């Protein structure tokens, strides 16, 4: 239009608009019709933008139920490598060496978690009100405690690194590097200033728990959830509990000495020290974005204290018995547990084949492999012992090194005083008949759409008795089968457990 | 790392997957758990992808209710130009010339509509089964009729172009260029092969119907909606109705000749001919995508035959009577009409301020002004004449040259035999208490999410009695005010109706 | 407006609209303006200098 070219001054004076609204603060759009107040709650003048979502992952060996599993193959390989350069101590097995290594991984994950907690609290920007209190709430700490005891937190994480330097683990194996990189980073969905932050929080750890002559057993160790005012004393208690049965074990000292002899001190994994001038910075990572987008929730871990009607002895433990399954490492968990002893009908929508969504047109093999690391489809229902089966558990076909349990989203409340909100959910949400459930689900959906590569959702309704497929924007997709997913997971786990 | 570089053959054999699923057919994902067949409806194995969305717009002069309106200023300017450049017949006025120009615009819109109908039918690609049957269904024709009478269709559209080209309209007025570029193209949401098509269909035309000493009055003319199997005889009836009082008229010939002398043939607007070798291609245009995204539906038009209890005489006509308002062109419609004589509760959600969402970080004034041409917010409810007010009508604060009435989306059915489906909706969707309404609304939302720059949604619930804000992914947004939008529309209309001097 | 009157932009807009209420959009006035244009073409016509933020 030549009129715009002829009157740019009037165009500029007519197009003066304030952009770049700082996120993390509640905004009211106002009323276009000033007399619409008679319809009080029939008009939505509120506008809240979420700014962070936490992916509650879990480190796993990858579906071992016999001696042909990648975990057992890596156990045999690492034991052969250690013992063929070892002249001396012969009192442990490949399985024992691998439980060590897994405990090393768990405490490395803990160190990365606490280091991220420390480095986040120094982040303050005018364009984002979520920084850093929302992130600290999502990770499950007390921002006031961190602000008051920054020095204590720094020295505690440094001491954690120093004490983790006592034992030795291989650095060629990429398990530790992948887990630390995943759990020690902030990821934006877009390369924009007011972007949304993606976080990974370990839902659980692997307290080593040696007792009895019937091998070892990695018992679950729970982790703080979002909205928990956990302090440095609680985190120190957690670390001491983790390393309580880890030091003072002469067999563990023997394993550490043998791996130190095998892999030289230069070839070990070392936790880097941190100081006051270390700044964590959100980064754009398309690979992590894609693998977050193609992630499927598996539910809460099952503990000994968790009651389950008809499913006894189904805890998430890594059992190692020399006289059971020929001494192979066994880890066969049952998914579909949410936390309460009821059906959780929403998990029924996970029984369909997953859809792998990818950006762009041409996809490389490595990118496709990295894009399905968190994907996990159920295969069969676990057989309930007894006539009562109030919960329903699904046995997976095979999973990768990490499994996603929940997703935590933090957003501004619509009501006064517009504080942060805690939203934990799986890939499937069940909405029963209620006055506010539908609008709450609508707010949930709109908040999730703000994130670019959000995980695909599977909504279900209690009144229609009908679920829904992926609630996502499909760009370049394919239908994945359980066998293909199992092959990809086997490849990825074997590659991760390599020396 | 090294393991991938050490077994790349097995990596490739494991990562060979079929991609680029052709859209336009129902895809069944199967069952991962073979025992899930007991839960019949609790597992959604269906996967349907929408392929086209139609924007049912309406050309408007731009909110005239006085002689000071931009349309009247432009009418005075163009009449002065023509009368000063010409010597001879002085028997019409600025208002008469302006309604002549509006009728010419309506004819051009109709010709572009039929030309696009003809040109779409020759589109076929293996990766999109929506071409061209779904596009024709959205446009409101019978694809069987088009393929049976292609020759008759080409002759009819060629005669329409020939008969519309007899009259003259200025090409320097960018009104015609904007309308033609809007109604003569297919637009993809992404620059990918399996993209979704954006389309523009005129909901209403502006039949002249010149009669009486009381000036002229451009009455609405309806057009075929989607899902109507209208044929060439119906389109010929529509054209003959449009030009019944316009072809062979001496005063109209006088006005067309005067416009020719004013703007000789070089400066006149011309319709491009269509034949068997004309191919239309989908194109990617971020400007039209943005102005689609920031578009707010205003509801169905009000006709003289449409009953409205408490709102009598609110037809969408362009009145020009010399004895009222000093002979100025009058056009002030009442929005909020859906088609039936009831409340239409979903329109209450539009009383909030609109949010102008734009891509990128830095936005030029050009993009900001071009991204809000279809936007329209209500200002005050129109008063109901009498004590009964079953419908509710909202008076706009000021609109651009086009107002969007409805949206139509075409997608495959989940059930056998997976035929196309018609989904007509405004920006606001109302769901009452029903077993199927919630799942249907979820299907609608998931279909809309597939479109990239889809218009923002305002859902309301029957048992909640509560609406919801913009159901869209905001990237870089601002809250727009009624006064700012009125200024923007005034500038846009003034720029739209421009005449050289 | 006299001195000591805190008249604002709305008052000045009211004054302008009152001044040109019967003068803008009038056919006889347009006829006279066109006749004056033909008499004294645009070179010989009086013009108002535009004002913006950089006029001192």
Curated annotation (Swiss-Prot), chain B:
Disulfide bonds: none annotated. GO terms for cellular component: T=3 icosahedral viral capsid. The record marks 19-20 as: Cleavage. InterPro entries: CP_picobirnavirus, CP_picobirnavirus_sf. Keywords: Acetylation, Capsid protein, T=3 icosahedral capsid protein, Virion. The 7 kDa polypeptide is acetylated. Picobirnavirus particles are capable of disrupting biological membranes in vitro. The capsid protein self-assembles to form an icosahedral capsid with a T=2 symmetry made of 120 subunits. Homodimer. This is Capsid protein precursor. It comes from Human picobirnavirus (strain Human/Thailand/Hy005102/-) (PBV). The lineage of its organism: Viruses, Riboviria, Orthornavirae, Pisuviricota, Duplopiviricetes. The gene is Segment-1.
Curated annotation (Swiss-Prot), chain C:
The 7 kDa polypeptide is acetylated. Disulfide bonds: none annotated. It comes from the Viruses. The capsid protein self-assembles to form an icosahedral capsid with a T=2 symmetry made of 120 subunits. Picobirnavirus particles are capable of disrupting biological membranes in vitro. Homodimer. This is Capsid protein precursor. It comes from Human picobirnavirus (strain Human/Thailand/Hy005102/-) (PBV). The chain holds residues 270 to 325 of 552 of the full protein.
